[PDB]
């Protein structure tokens, strides 16, 4: 059950991550770091806000901040080295 | 109701309440000295009211114990690892040794 | 004449001929009933004040809200390559 | 349910011919965990108050 | 690593020691496998509870009521602790 | 013969193997080979190679 909780918080973040990927590719037309970072100083802040909010929500899931730290303590049900 | 003061059912009951109170002390308290102090105080609180004969006051006292035990519940009780609420319960279950029943006449 | 089937027809039992395999399931009798019920719920479903709540929610309100969202936001956003100060909308 | 009792299916804590509720998928062990310490309303009070 | 195993004699040695350290016992040299708790050793109906709680902490167990109230003998407790693979 | 062979193969859990020299076959336990299914010669030699041909062709049409 802890495994299911961990992987379903993962997808609760990954969904927004794909939303960010879809937005990055609508805006910049690409996904690679070089182009996106050579241009990001020209594109509307509302668009970067939408992008970074989604990527951050994914990072909130994996990095287990207060909203989605549920899985982390449950993930101790495995072996210690894990 | 009729909770008789000198019968086996009340004995089972009060023994369970005493076990529960001791485990609650052991879970709440960290140090050992204070655990023994609280244990002795509880045994005193029990022996003080082992003598009652009226069923009414007896049952009122049992209700007060129920409320007290509900009021000092512990959310993360100490339990052994290899027993149900523990970290090592059904870790490596020896699989039941069973023989291959067959389902089809041509396939393994 | 007594009207009965022809005696030239020689009849016999139906042997599908499967090899009767051993019992690899232990039927439980209550799980099966729970499944029969959850499977044929449709033939007993009745309209009441909760069924009606769920039905009208999921078949009136949410579809209507999603459609209002769509038919407002139809040709609105268009923000491929947009830049600072430029509007992302095509309308007001 | 008491874990120390001997059930046929010790993991799910179910006996063989035990009747099932219509919403048993919510009330088995694979279902989400219940918490018995705080009643959920006071829990919501405490979470949002913090 | 943890190369350790339990034995009926060892469980008996630990249980009698646990009972020899108990002040509310009648007196020593009544304690044996055939010792009763309420009759021989002379214990209340709560000292039996304290003794069972003590056997739990000693051998690392969790003995419920329906298995505890039936312990009215030391050999019974020995056979019980021998009937838990995790008896430490 | 099909029915007898297979009912015995399941029940006894043996196959009948006549060894080289003695003209007397009996049920035996050896099953590590010498048994093939009727669907292998078709698939592994007509389907799979055609799938591999399909892969090669998709790659070199790309
Ligand atoms: C519309 C358009 C549609 C487009 C479709 C596109 C076309 C589709 C293409 C289909 C290909 C089908 C081929 C085929 O028929 O195989 C049949 C056949 C079926 O498998 P089988 O072994 O006979 O199954 C019976 C059991 O083995 C018998 O039972 P068993 O007892 O032996 O059990 C063993 C079984 C049991 O184990 C399991 O159950 C495990 C789960 C199996 C997962 C297998 C998935 C693949 C895993 C790949 C891992 C790679 C990660 C990276 O495990 C396995 O068989 C897997 C072994 C793992 C590989 C061995 C490691 C050696 C290295 O497989 C083969 O004979 C080999 C095919 C392998 C091809 C892989 C392609 C690799 C390409 C190379 C890369 C570099 C060049 C590429 C560019 C090339 C340009 C020319
Ligand atoms: C009401 C309609 C909803 C429609 C939209 C969908 C909304 C989100 C999805 C919720 C829908 C219900 C999901 C039900 C799945 C339950 C599956 C299941 O049975 O597994 C239970 C599992 C928890 O397992 P558990 O029993 O707790 O075991 C722990 C003991 N070791 O369960 C889990 O692990 C949970 C998996 C889901 C995790 C979702 C976490 C959401 C938390 C959001 C917090 C707010 C964060 C801010 C987000 C920003 C948004 C702008
Ligand atoms: C928005 C969509 C909402 C869906 C509306 C459908 C409601 C409905 O059809 O009602 C069913 C009603 C029987 O309802 P009920 O009492 O629950 O079942 C009888 C068992 N005692 O029975 C009826 O409604 C009967 C209506 C008959 C009209 C048929 C229309 C003519 C077709 C040409
Ligand atoms: C905001 C203020 C609220 C903070 C939470 C207070 C917990 C109350 C408590 O009494 O908890 C005390 C425990 C230490 O107890 P322990 O002996 O080590 O073992 C656990 C024993 N229990 C179960 C009986 C608690 O936690 C602490 O060390 C908190 C010390 C305060 C440090 C602040 C700096
Ligand atoms: C829970 C079950 C109960 C709820 C069931 C809900 C089902 C929907 C029923 C309500 C239908 C109302 O439908 C309503 O829409 C049409 C247009 O769409 C309205 O009619 C309108 O049509 C437009 C053309 O689209 C005309 O140019 C005109 O402007 C008019 O105002 C009517 O005022 C009415 O027919």
XYZ file of C-alpha atoms and ligand atoms in Angstrom:
718
model
C 0.000 0.000 0.000
C 2.904 2.338 0.663
C 4.212 1.462 -2.774
C 0.911 2.388 -4.343
C 0.853 5.651 -2.424
C 4.330 6.559 -3.556
C 3.748 5.854 -7.220
C 0.368 7.593 -7.260
C 1.840 10.775 -5.811
C 4.456 10.362 -8.515
C 1.839 10.439 -11.228
C -0.005 13.241 -9.436
C 3.133 15.228 -10.086
C 3.919 13.740 -13.466
C 0.537 14.765 -14.832
C 1.386 18.392 -14.245
C 4.849 17.708 -15.568
C 3.361 16.584 -18.874
C 1.179 19.662 -18.832
C 4.383 21.642 -18.572
C 5.954 19.669 -21.383
C 2.948 20.322 -23.574
C 3.199 24.031 -22.780
C 6.951 24.226 -23.295
C 6.515 22.690 -26.704
C 3.585 24.887 -27.672
C 5.580 27.967 -26.756
C 9.191 27.333 -27.704
C 8.454 24.520 -30.140
C 11.145 22.362 -28.598
C 12.049 20.589 -25.388
C 15.835 20.954 -25.138
C 17.578 23.055 -22.524
C 19.712 25.015 -24.972
C 16.942 26.685 -26.948
C 14.634 27.220 -24.002
C 17.296 28.920 -21.927
C 18.600 31.044 -24.781
C 15.091 32.490 -25.221
C 13.314 32.488 -21.858
C 14.195 36.133 -21.283
C 11.863 37.133 -24.124
C 8.624 35.211 -23.471
C 5.594 36.332 -21.507
C 5.803 35.892 -17.780
C 2.327 34.384 -17.600
C 3.536 31.500 -19.728
C 6.630 30.807 -17.690
C 4.464 31.053 -14.580
C 2.176 28.314 -15.867
C 5.154 26.192 -16.869
C 7.075 26.566 -13.643
C 4.010 26.096 -11.467
C 3.408 22.722 -13.061
C 7.033 21.649 -12.900
C 7.159 22.798 -9.312
C 4.014 20.823 -8.455
C 5.837 17.805 -9.806
C 8.857 18.702 -7.743
C 6.616 19.146 -4.710
C 5.441 15.562 -5.126
C 8.875 14.005 -5.565
C 10.646 16.322 -3.121
C 7.947 15.592 -0.575
C 7.145 19.077 0.662
C 4.279 19.564 3.088
C 1.400 19.042 0.691
C 2.637 15.677 -0.565
C 5.010 14.330 2.069
C 2.555 11.490 2.775
C 4.406 8.908 0.726
C 7.805 9.576 2.218
C 7.243 8.198 5.689
C 5.320 5.276 4.231
C 8.267 4.533 1.946
C 10.209 3.309 4.973
C 8.248 0.042 4.816
C 10.947 -1.227 2.489
C 14.457 -2.300 3.366
C 16.825 0.212 4.905
C 19.253 0.470 1.950
C 16.363 1.535 -0.219
C -27.256 -4.085 33.846
C -25.797 -6.460 36.477
C -21.989 -6.215 36.725
C -21.414 -8.561 39.664
C -18.519 -7.474 41.952
C -17.128 -10.956 42.724
C -17.409 -13.075 39.569
C -15.187 -14.229 36.739
C -16.526 -11.797 34.146
C -15.661 -8.759 36.233
C -12.300 -10.400 36.893
C -11.600 -10.683 33.154
C -12.721 -7.108 32.708
C -10.595 -5.576 35.433
C -7.586 -7.640 34.456
C -7.924 -6.304 30.925
C -8.205 -2.750 32.210
C -5.092 -3.266 34.279
C -3.135 -4.659 31.327
C -4.261 -1.778 29.155
C -3.346 0.846 31.735
C 0.108 -0.624 32.171
C 0.771 -0.754 28.439
C -0.417 2.837 28.123
C 2.063 3.859 30.772
C 4.853 1.952 29.082
C 4.086 3.572 25.742
C 3.647 7.094 27.044
C 6.657 7.170 29.338
C 10.240 6.935 28.085
C 12.309 6.405 31.225
C 11.910 3.277 33.342
C 11.783 4.732 36.869
C 8.744 6.812 36.076
C 7.141 3.782 34.436
C 7.517 1.783 37.614
C 6.189 4.699 39.648
C 3.077 5.026 37.518
C 2.621 1.270 37.587
C 2.697 1.185 41.353
C 0.329 4.137 41.539
C -2.111 2.320 39.265
C -1.919 -0.860 41.309
C -2.693 1.273 44.338
C -5.615 2.949 42.575
C -6.940 -0.530 41.754
C -6.466 -2.171 45.157
C -8.188 0.857 46.684
C -11.388 0.026 44.774
C -11.157 -3.760 44.688
C -13.355 -3.765 47.819
C -16.602 -2.295 46.485
C -19.837 -4.315 46.748
C -22.622 -2.105 45.387
C -22.942 -2.913 41.643
C -23.961 0.675 40.888
C -20.847 2.438 42.158
C -18.764 -0.378 40.696
C -20.175 0.160 37.235
C -19.760 3.922 37.558
C -16.108 3.347 38.443
C -15.626 1.058 35.464
C -17.090 3.735 33.217
C -14.662 6.245 34.700
C -11.803 3.876 33.882
C -13.082 3.555 30.336
C -13.132 7.316 29.947
C -9.651 7.632 31.437
C -8.194 4.972 29.166
C -9.827 6.630 26.185
C -8.335 9.925 27.351
C -4.737 8.627 27.514
C -4.781 6.544 24.336
C -1.522 6.237 22.434
C -1.566 6.569 18.633
C 1.719 4.672 18.020
C 1.776 1.817 20.533
C 4.871 -0.265 21.119
C 4.335 -3.663 19.502
C 6.883 -6.409 18.665
C 8.118 -6.383 15.081
C 7.045 -9.931 14.267
C 3.472 -9.420 15.498
C 0.572 -7.862 13.624
C 1.026 -4.121 14.041
C 4.771 -4.406 13.501
C 7.442 -3.741 10.933
C 8.425 -7.360 10.244
C 5.089 -9.181 10.296
C 4.499 -10.888 6.942
C 7.973 -10.133 5.672
C 9.215 -13.505 4.389
C 6.274 -15.880 4.664
C 7.287 -19.451 3.931
C 5.156 -20.306 0.909
C 2.729 -23.140 1.406
C 4.171 -26.220 -0.243
C 1.583 -27.192 -2.852
C 1.536 -29.545 -5.813
C 0.851 -28.480 -9.375
C -2.784 -29.086 -10.140
C -3.389 -29.304 -13.866
C -5.983 -27.436 -15.910
C -5.459 -28.556 -19.517
C -4.885 -31.863 -21.238
C -2.188 -30.771 -23.707
C -0.461 -27.786 -22.152
C 1.811 -27.894 -19.136
C -52.443 -41.793 -36.991
C -50.970 -40.632 -33.688
C -48.850 -37.566 -34.420
C -45.436 -38.271 -32.949
C -41.837 -37.911 -34.140
C -40.377 -40.378 -36.598
C -38.822 -43.486 -35.067
C -35.992 -43.514 -37.605
C -34.351 -40.614 -35.764
C -31.849 -42.149 -33.338
C -31.135 -39.656 -30.555
C -28.548 -39.444 -27.807
C -26.892 -37.259 -25.184
C -24.702 -34.220 -25.712
C -21.082 -34.947 -24.771
C -19.043 -31.799 -25.354
C -16.052 -33.988 -24.535
C -13.946 -31.741 -22.354
C -11.510 -33.410 -19.979
C -12.923 -32.710 -16.527
C -9.986 -31.156 -14.718
C -9.463 -31.136 -10.959
C -10.852 -28.480 -8.642
C -8.379 -25.585 -8.688
C -10.869 -23.112 -7.181
C -12.763 -23.248 -3.924
C -16.017 -21.410 -4.525
C -17.094 -19.383 -1.494
C -20.808 -18.761 -2.000
C -20.928 -15.257 -0.537
C -18.316 -13.639 -2.764
C -20.243 -15.019 -5.715
C -23.449 -13.423 -4.485
C -21.721 -10.094 -3.951
C -20.523 -10.330 -7.520
C -23.947 -11.259 -8.878
C -25.345 -8.227 -7.149
C -22.664 -5.782 -8.230
C -23.015 -7.144 -11.771
C -26.823 -6.951 -12.073
C -27.298 -3.728 -10.088
C -28.881 -2.282 -13.223
C -32.004 -4.425 -12.929
C -32.682 -3.202 -9.389
C -31.538 0.428 -9.570
C -34.236 2.830 -8.450
C -34.459 6.593 -8.521
C -34.217 8.340 -5.157
C -32.886 11.576 -3.702
C -29.201 10.519 -3.838
C -29.295 8.680 -7.144
C -30.950 11.780 -8.531
C -28.268 14.029 -7.094
C -25.472 12.037 -8.694
C -27.333 11.630 -11.975
C -28.168 15.289 -12.449
C -24.683 16.358 -11.335
C -22.789 14.159 -13.742
C -25.288 14.483 -16.629
C -26.423 18.131 -16.450
C -24.163 20.370 -14.431
C -20.651 19.154 -15.172
C -21.331 18.740 -18.920
C -22.856 22.210 -19.001
C -19.946 23.729 -17.136
C -17.378 22.069 -19.382
C -19.296 23.305 -22.400
C -19.479 26.853 -21.129
C -15.722 26.719 -20.588
C -15.125 25.432 -24.093
C -17.460 27.712 -25.980
C -15.986 30.692 -24.197
C -12.349 29.629 -24.644
C -12.870 28.445 -28.227
C -10.451 30.582 -30.239
C -9.116 32.612 -27.354
C -5.592 31.489 -26.481
C -2.828 31.531 -29.106
C 0.575 31.912 -27.457
C 3.219 30.178 -29.526
C 6.362 32.258 -29.242
C 4.658 35.230 -27.625
C 6.732 37.879 -25.925
C 6.593 40.359 -23.087
C 3.757 42.844 -23.335
C 2.076 41.011 -26.173
C -1.355 39.687 -25.281
C -1.870 35.937 -25.258
C -5.570 36.297 -26.106
C -7.234 36.999 -29.448
C -10.262 38.686 -27.814
C -11.384 40.607 -24.739
C -11.037 -6.219 13.656
C -9.043 -8.031 16.291
C -5.794 -9.202 14.660
C -5.111 -11.810 17.310
C -8.088 -13.977 16.337
C -7.502 -16.886 13.966
C -9.214 -16.221 10.650
C -9.033 -18.520 7.652
C -7.585 -15.660 5.549
C -5.341 -14.171 8.203
C -4.072 -11.381 5.965
C -7.428 -9.921 4.962
C -9.030 -10.893 8.300
C -11.911 -12.724 6.655
C -13.440 -16.106 7.342
C -14.561 -18.289 4.486
C -18.357 -17.915 4.384
C -18.466 -14.506 6.014
C -21.189 -12.353 4.404
C -20.030 -9.270 2.500
C -21.512 -5.799 2.472
C -22.422 -4.164 -0.788
C -19.529 -1.724 -0.284
C -16.923 -4.217 0.895
C -14.304 -2.848 -1.463
C -14.178 0.120 0.920
C -14.205 -1.989 4.097
C -11.453 -4.555 3.490
C -7.744 -4.312 4.211
C -6.737 -3.207 0.714
C -8.977 -0.199 1.229
C -7.546 3.105 2.478
C -6.450 3.074 6.086
C -8.674 4.291 8.853
C -7.358 6.281 11.817
C -8.886 5.603 15.232
C -7.253 8.319 17.335
C -8.807 11.568 16.136
C -12.279 11.788 14.745
C -11.974 13.296 11.335
C -13.767 16.565 12.046
C -11.430 17.472 14.877
C -8.596 16.402 12.608
C -9.680 18.907 10.000
C -9.920 21.551 12.690
C -6.378 20.826 13.812
C -4.852 20.679 10.327
C -6.419 23.879 9.061
C -5.820 25.612 12.385
C -2.119 24.812 12.276
C 25.272 -12.734 13.123
C 22.254 -13.368 15.394
C 23.221 -16.988 16.013
C 20.836 -17.589 18.902
C 17.981 -20.027 19.618
C 15.598 -20.743 22.493
C 15.071 -23.965 24.419
C 12.533 -25.258 26.917
C 15.119 -25.324 29.685
C 16.225 -21.761 29.000
C 12.651 -20.508 29.010
C 12.148 -22.284 32.316
C 15.273 -20.727 33.814
C 14.170 -17.251 32.812
C 10.604 -17.645 34.035
C 11.581 -18.909 37.477
C 14.124 -16.093 37.792
C 11.410 -13.618 36.861
C 9.299 -15.124 39.615
C 12.128 -15.203 42.155
C 12.515 -11.431 41.740
C 8.803 -10.932 42.490
C 8.233 -9.667 46.030
C 4.543 -10.615 46.244
C 5.324 -14.313 45.869
C 4.755 -16.496 48.940
C 8.346 -17.675 49.124
C 10.939 -19.349 46.955
C 11.281 -23.142 46.451
C 7.571 -23.396 45.681
C 8.310 -22.312 42.100
C 8.324 -25.207 39.637
C 6.771 -26.248 36.339
C 3.753 -27.534 38.288
C 3.433 -24.272 40.240
C 0.027 -22.625 40.205
C -0.176 -18.842 40.423
C -3.299 -18.397 42.563
C -2.904 -21.406 44.869
C 0.768 -22.304 45.322
C 2.633 -19.044 44.800
C -0.180 -17.100 46.433
C -0.894 -14.281 44.027
C -3.808 -11.918 43.594
C -5.878 -11.728 40.431
C -3.822 -8.712 39.357
C -0.387 -10.140 40.151
C -1.057 -12.769 37.517
C -1.561 -9.889 35.113
C 1.686 -8.227 36.155
C 3.503 -11.536 35.778
C 2.170 -11.979 32.256
C 3.160 -8.448 31.338
C 6.594 -9.354 32.671
C 6.867 -12.486 30.535
C 5.995 -10.347 27.527
C 8.794 -7.854 28.067
C 11.170 -10.715 28.883
C 10.620 -12.819 25.755
C 9.399 -9.986 23.526
C 5.793 -10.996 22.878
C 2.245 -9.656 22.849
C -0.146 -11.953 24.714
C -3.850 -11.073 24.300
C -6.594 -11.666 26.857
C -7.973 -14.924 25.486
C -4.460 -16.415 25.656
C -3.563 -14.717 28.974
C -6.447 -15.543 31.292
C -5.932 -19.236 30.546
C -2.367 -19.040 31.948
C -2.902 -20.402 35.462
C 0.360 -22.353 35.627
C 4.046 -21.828 34.956
C 4.406 -24.850 32.684
C 1.460 -23.490 30.712
C 3.408 -20.270 30.225
C 6.418 -22.307 29.159
C 4.461 -24.232 26.546
C 3.010 -20.940 25.346
C 6.356 -19.192 24.946
C 7.546 -22.318 23.178
C 4.583 -21.864 20.784
C 5.700 -18.524 19.359
C 8.542 -18.760 16.801
C 9.512 -15.158 17.633
C 10.012 -15.841 21.335
C 13.427 -14.078 21.360
C -3.969 -42.228 -30.102
C -4.097 -38.501 -29.460
C -6.464 -38.984 -26.529
C -4.565 -41.920 -25.019
C -1.177 -40.246 -25.366
C -2.295 -37.075 -23.695
C -4.456 -38.538 -20.933
C -1.526 -40.719 -19.937
C 0.901 -37.820 -20.245
C -1.195 -35.897 -17.725
C -2.190 -38.656 -15.342
C 0.938 -40.787 -15.070
C 3.211 -37.814 -15.779
C 5.263 -39.963 -18.118
C 5.855 -40.253 -21.853
C 6.483 -43.475 -23.768
C 10.054 -43.692 -25.070
C 11.261 -46.721 -26.991
C 15.019 -46.820 -26.559
C 17.359 -47.650 -29.428
C 17.792 -51.421 -29.352
C 15.073 -53.083 -27.263
C 11.695 -53.286 -29.000
C 9.739 -52.524 -25.832
C 8.487 -49.023 -25.039
C 7.172 -47.987 -21.649
C 6.224 -44.846 -19.811
C 9.216 -42.761 -18.719
C 10.024 -39.562 -16.846
C 12.495 -37.937 -19.236
C 10.832 -34.782 -20.590
C 13.749 -32.354 -21.077
C 13.319 -32.452 -24.855
C 11.982 -34.788 -27.519
C 8.562 -33.073 -27.161
C 7.401 -30.401 -29.583
C 4.142 -28.594 -30.103
C 2.245 -28.497 -33.375
C 2.319 -24.698 -33.599
C 6.074 -24.137 -33.480
C 7.178 -24.948 -37.014
C 4.637 -22.524 -38.401
C 5.233 -19.551 -36.155
C 8.940 -19.514 -35.357
C 9.792 -20.066 -39.049
C 7.093 -18.123 -40.951
C 5.654 -15.441 -38.659
C 8.599 -14.184 -36.618
C 11.001 -13.882 -39.572
C 8.324 -11.947 -41.406
C 8.014 -9.617 -38.434
C 11.763 -9.126 -38.514
C 11.517 -8.377 -42.221
C 8.848 -5.822 -41.360
C 11.153 -4.182 -38.844
C 14.033 -4.041 -41.297
C 11.765 -2.560 -43.923
C 10.330 0.101 -41.643
C 13.849 1.098 -40.653
C 15.162 1.334 -44.202
C 12.047 3.095 -45.480
C 12.513 5.704 -42.760
C 1.455 -0.918 -37.609
C 2.958 -0.943 -37.577
C 3.369 -1.835 -36.393
C 4.904 -1.723 -36.217
C 5.451 -3.030 -35.574
C 6.998 -3.024 -35.677
C 7.509 -4.461 -36.008
C 7.444 -5.379 -34.749
C 8.797 -6.106 -34.523
C 8.510 -7.450 -33.806
C 9.843 -8.220 -33.574
C 9.455 -9.689 -33.228
C 10.670 -10.633 -33.285
C 10.175 -12.023 -32.782
O 9.315 -12.606 -33.364
O 10.720 -12.599 -31.610
C 10.074 -13.805 -31.255
C 10.712 -14.435 -30.010
C 9.720 -14.506 -28.859
O 10.403 -14.708 -27.642
P 10.619 -16.254 -27.060
O 11.931 -16.410 -26.457
O 10.691 -17.251 -28.114
O 9.454 -16.661 -25.953
C 9.478 -17.993 -25.496
C 10.241 -18.136 -24.146
O 11.556 -17.687 -24.331
C 10.269 -19.611 -23.687
O 10.038 -19.709 -22.301
P 11.333 -19.579 -21.269
O 11.409 -20.705 -20.347
O 12.610 -19.730 -21.936
O 11.191 -18.132 -20.447
C 12.051 -17.053 -20.748
C 11.260 -15.752 -20.763
C 10.510 -15.616 -19.440
O 10.841 -14.385 -18.847
C 9.872 -13.363 -18.688
O 8.725 -13.590 -18.638
C 10.395 -11.921 -18.507
C 9.552 -10.856 -19.252
C 9.867 -10.822 -20.765
C 9.952 -9.344 -21.260
C 10.532 -9.328 -22.704
C 10.316 -7.897 -23.278
C 11.623 -7.407 -23.992
C 12.705 -7.043 -22.918
C 13.875 -6.272 -23.589
C 14.806 -5.739 -22.479
C 15.781 -4.702 -23.072
C 15.838 -3.450 -22.183
C 16.708 -2.384 -22.859
O 12.141 -14.683 -20.896
C 12.456 -14.281 -22.222
O 12.222 -14.976 -23.153
C 13.127 -12.899 -22.439
C 14.658 -13.024 -22.325
C 15.343 -11.645 -22.128
C 16.347 -11.376 -23.303
C 17.605 -12.305 -23.211
C 18.930 -11.531 -22.928
C 20.019 -11.770 -23.981
C 20.741 -10.441 -24.243
O 11.818 -13.652 -29.614
C 13.029 -13.843 -30.367
O 13.243 -14.866 -30.932
C 14.088 -12.699 -30.429
C 13.470 -11.346 -30.834
C 14.343 -10.219 -30.158
C 14.311 -8.912 -31.016
C 14.540 -7.652 -30.129
C 14.928 -6.454 -31.074
C 16.310 -5.853 -30.633
C 16.920 -4.952 -31.763
C 18.482 -4.835 -31.590
C 18.951 -3.384 -31.155
C 20.032 -2.781 -32.134
C 19.634 -2.783 -33.681
C 18.136 -2.365 -33.899
C 17.925 -1.714 -35.302
C 17.783 -2.882 -36.331
C 17.807 -2.371 -37.810
C 17.780 -3.575 -38.764
C -13.687 13.533 -6.419
C -13.347 13.393 -7.916
C -11.855 13.586 -8.200
C -11.611 13.696 -9.695
C -10.241 14.284 -9.998
C -9.107 13.432 -9.406
C -8.559 14.029 -8.109
C -7.271 13.368 -7.660
C -7.405 11.870 -7.416
C -8.328 11.513 -6.262
C -9.384 10.482 -6.634
C -9.453 9.394 -5.568
C -8.277 8.442 -5.643
C -8.631 7.128 -4.977
C -7.548 6.102 -5.254
C -7.398 5.152 -4.091
C -6.719 3.872 -4.529
C -6.418 3.044 -3.287
O -7.245 2.325 -2.842
O -5.168 3.138 -2.673
C -5.159 3.861 -1.477
C -3.958 4.799 -1.491
C -3.424 4.998 -0.075
O -2.998 3.791 0.487
P -3.061 3.671 2.126
O -4.244 2.820 2.478
O -3.231 5.039 2.738
O -1.732 2.917 2.745
C -0.910 3.550 3.675
C -0.488 2.535 4.716
N 0.904 2.166 4.550
O -4.372 6.014 -2.044
C -3.356 6.898 -2.422
O -2.227 6.611 -2.275
C -3.681 8.272 -2.983
C -3.426 8.412 -4.478
C -3.925 9.780 -4.952
C -2.977 10.889 -4.508
C -3.622 12.244 -4.754
C -3.055 13.235 -3.742
C -3.721 14.583 -3.902
C -3.279 15.507 -2.777
C -3.531 16.949 -3.204
C -3.123 17.912 -2.095
C -3.197 19.349 -2.612
C -1.903 19.715 -3.335
C -2.062 20.985 -4.165
C -2.192 20.646 -5.648
C -2.093 21.929 -6.468
C -3.204 21.990 -7.526
C -3.252 23.391 -8.154
C -31.371 14.227 -18.083
C -31.652 12.736 -18.312
C -32.347 12.171 -17.076
C -32.823 10.742 -17.341
C -34.350 10.676 -17.170
C -34.872 9.233 -17.188
C -35.871 9.025 -16.048
C -36.805 7.864 -16.328
O -36.813 7.339 -17.390
O -37.660 7.472 -15.291
C -37.951 6.112 -15.186
C -39.387 5.947 -14.749
C -39.388 4.812 -13.738
O -38.733 5.229 -12.571
P -38.617 4.252 -11.249
O -39.630 4.590 -10.266
O -37.419 4.530 -10.473
O -38.651 2.664 -11.677
C -39.861 1.964 -11.647
C -39.723 0.829 -10.653
N -40.713 1.021 -9.612
O -40.206 5.649 -15.848
C -40.420 6.658 -16.813
O -39.804 7.665 -16.796
C -41.475 6.446 -17.903
C -41.434 7.503 -18.994
C -42.037 6.899 -20.272
C -41.947 7.867 -21.446
C -41.318 7.201 -22.670
C -41.120 8.265 -23.740
C -41.681 7.930 -25.137
C -40.568 7.489 -26.090
C -40.876 7.748 -27.552
C 5.274 24.823 19.581
C 5.615 24.088 20.891
C 5.135 22.615 20.816
C 6.313 21.626 20.625
C 5.823 20.178 20.879
C 5.818 19.845 22.405
C 5.716 18.295 22.649
C 5.273 18.053 24.110
C 6.022 16.868 24.793
O 5.911 16.708 25.962
O 6.845 15.963 24.056
C 8.145 15.820 24.614
C 9.049 15.097 23.615
C 10.264 14.537 24.323
O 9.802 13.461 25.105
P 10.783 12.140 25.371
O 11.021 11.948 26.791
O 12.124 12.332 24.819
O 10.018 10.792 24.776
C 8.677 10.954 24.335
C 7.782 10.958 25.601
N 6.374 11.418 25.423
C 5.648 10.512 24.541
C 5.721 11.370 26.737
C 6.275 12.767 24.848
O 9.449 15.954 22.565
C 10.384 17.008 22.811
O 11.538 16.782 22.979
C 9.856 18.463 22.820
C 10.741 19.352 23.709
C 10.450 20.830 23.384
C 11.610 21.391 22.544
C 11.288 22.760 21.994
C 12.598 23.372 21.526
C -32.230 16.510 -14.267
C -33.106 16.493 -15.521
C -33.705 17.863 -15.754
C -32.770 18.761 -16.555
C -32.697 18.343 -18.046
C -31.819 19.314 -18.818
C -31.951 19.061 -20.326
C -31.866 20.406 -21.095
C -33.289 20.987 -21.184
C -33.301 22.532 -21.277
C -33.318 22.918 -22.764
C -33.445 24.432 -22.904
O -33.146 24.756 -24.234
C -33.157 26.082 -24.514
O -32.115 26.294 -25.463
C -32.498 26.902 -26.674
C -31.176 27.156 -27.390
O -30.224 26.181 -27.050
C -33.299 28.159 -26.401
O -33.676 28.859 -27.590
C -32.743 29.797 -28.076
O -32.252 29.202 -29.223
C -31.423 29.965 -30.010
C -30.768 29.062 -31.054
O -29.843 28.232 -30.429
C -32.363 30.983 -30.635
O -31.699 31.727 -31.630
C -32.901 31.912 -29.556
O -31.879 32.795 -29.184
C -33.417 31.157 -28.310
O -33.218 31.977 -27.166
C -34.593 27.836 -25.727
O -34.873 28.857 -24.775
C -34.576 26.468 -25.029
O -35.000 25.468 -25.878
